[PDB]
Amino acid sequence: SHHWGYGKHNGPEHWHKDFPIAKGERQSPVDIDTHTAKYDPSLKPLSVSYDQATSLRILNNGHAFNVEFDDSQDKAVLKGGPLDGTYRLIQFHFHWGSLDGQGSEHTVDKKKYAAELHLVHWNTKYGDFGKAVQQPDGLAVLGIFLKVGSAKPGLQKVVDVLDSIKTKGKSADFTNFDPRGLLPESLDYWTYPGSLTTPPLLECVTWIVLKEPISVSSEQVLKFRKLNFNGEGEPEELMVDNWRPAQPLKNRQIKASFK
Numbered sequence: 001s002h003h004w005g006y007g008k009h010n011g012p013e014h015w016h017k018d019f020p021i022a023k024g025e026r027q028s029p030v031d032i033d034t035h036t037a038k039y040d041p042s043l044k045p046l047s048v049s050y051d052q053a054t055s056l057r058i059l060n061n062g063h064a065f066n067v068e069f070d071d072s073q074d075k076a077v078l079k080g081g082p083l084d085g086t087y088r089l090i091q092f093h094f095h096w097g098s099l100d101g102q103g104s105e106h107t108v109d110k111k112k113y114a115a116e117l118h119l120v121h122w123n124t125k126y127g128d129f130g131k132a133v134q135q136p137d138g139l140a141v142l143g144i145f146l147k148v149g150s151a152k153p154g155l156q157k158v159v160d161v162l163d164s165i166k167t168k169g170k171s172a173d174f175t176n177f178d179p180r181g182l183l184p185e186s187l188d189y190w191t192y193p194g195s196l197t198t199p200p201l202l203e204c205v206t207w208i209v210l211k212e213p214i215s216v217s218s219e220q221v222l223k224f225r226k227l228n229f230n231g232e233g234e235p236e237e238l239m240v241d242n243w244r245p246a247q248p249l250k251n252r253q254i255k256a257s258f259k
């Protein structure tokens with residue numbers, strides 16, 4: 001049993017052996033060189049319509065925790081921005097560090113943030129998530145950086161349920177969670193074509209990364225770091241440093257919605 005993860009012998013530098021697309025032409029994350037990102041006056045404002053989002057459950061999957069949504073109806077949708085058509089929210093999750101100085105997957109002029117939130121959405125033209133990931137425009141992931149400072153009040157219900165899903169394969173009911181509480185004020189963004197940042201690393205993602213980070217407290221991110229990558233009754237491996245580092249841009253162009 002030598003499944004992928006985030007250590008010496010199974011972390012990101014090992015993934016190409018099971019998932020050769022790891023060395024592909026549109027892999028994520030990337031460093032966002034803000035001086036080289038082209039302002040693109042044809043980009044539209046991002047449309048985030050989360051009023052009717054229905055969260056269902058929260059799950060420790062052994063790599064992160066996912067807050068899952070009902071996506072059987074057109075309720076929590078992302079559109080506009082660089083996108084054609086309409087993408088439905090299915091789950092969100094985070095990547096974070098063992099220390100405040102690292103943890104994000106994307107970087108901004110090589111700056112690492114303490115964590116990074118991914119709101120994952122699938123293109124409704126493909127009928128469901130599983131079919132969507134097989135298509136080059138199947139997913140739109142909205143990435144939002146976290147820095148440590150003042151608490152994010154909208155985050156606290158998530159933080160408070162983590163002790164209930166400490167270990168791999170634990171889940172809990174998680175209804176009426178409103179993801180609008182996790183958004184910064186500005187929807188200014190950079191966008192580029194890339195991939196899922198975990199295996200299977202499929203090249204199916206339009207990345208939209210917001211320029212404005214949200215602030216979370218030290219106590220909030222400390223609670224993320226009390227999670228476990230192991231299952232109950234196994235030796236404790238703290239769930240930290242579950243981020244993939246920046247991958248080669250390979251001449252793709254990152255576009256900015258601003259400036």
Ligand SMILES: Cc1cc(C)nc(SCC(=O)c2ccc(S(N)(=O)=O)cc2)n1
Pocket residue numbers: 118120130133141195196197198199200202
């Ligand atoms: C492709 C695929 C098919 C099935 C049946 N399950 C999963 S779990 C991995 C995943 O859902 C996922 C979603 C978003 C990201 S990210 N980190 O790029 O936002 C990474 C993995 N993935």
Ligand SMILES: [Zn+2]
Pocket residue numbers: 093094095118197
């Ligand atoms: Zn992610």
